[PDB]
Amino acid sequence: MKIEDIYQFFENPPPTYLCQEVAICYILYVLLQGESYGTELIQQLETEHPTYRLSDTVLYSAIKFLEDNRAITGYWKKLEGRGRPRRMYQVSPEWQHQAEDLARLWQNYIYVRTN
């Protein structure tokens, strides 16, 4: 690291990487609107909220948590115009209401931090 990197850190703050607790709520917030997959969950976040990021590590730690708890289901889908199938996630019916509650936490979290 260089001394200039210190100044840069304060001048141009790096993006905030979601921790697992927040990522879980963000993921459920998205899945409640419709099925999505890993790469899209990450891309959608940084495209709409440029000062935010979701790492592969946190993403799949969150997915593991959700699948271990039977909160979501996954299935492989062949997307149009793409050769590589993607594993689509959907909220399990049993978690619909609980998921809505967690999704609210993300909606409020991002709103308060950007307004």
Add this chain to the structure above:
Amino acid sequence: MKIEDIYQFFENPPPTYLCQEVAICYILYVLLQGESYGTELIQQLETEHPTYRLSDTVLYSAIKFLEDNRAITGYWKKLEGRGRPRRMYQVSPEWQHQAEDLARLWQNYIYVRTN
């Protein structure tokens, strides 16, 4: 983890662990006040700013940076009543001005995120 941990994250935000860039400025801020040592640098942060923490890993990543750049000097101090010596740090004489500039970054950083 557990669902309750998710709710806890939002209801009772966990303290912020300093990243290297910020820790470097915080450490210089303290050293400008007088010589200090690792354990004190960590404890003093929590005491002065209860919503912040400094990990042992970031502390010594910061110390490495400072020593590599000759911004601080280290030496062994014998304490009365204790067998194990203590490793003390002091800002290097010629780094006075630069350390003060970096210290200001810390003060502003902590001011905006705490006041």
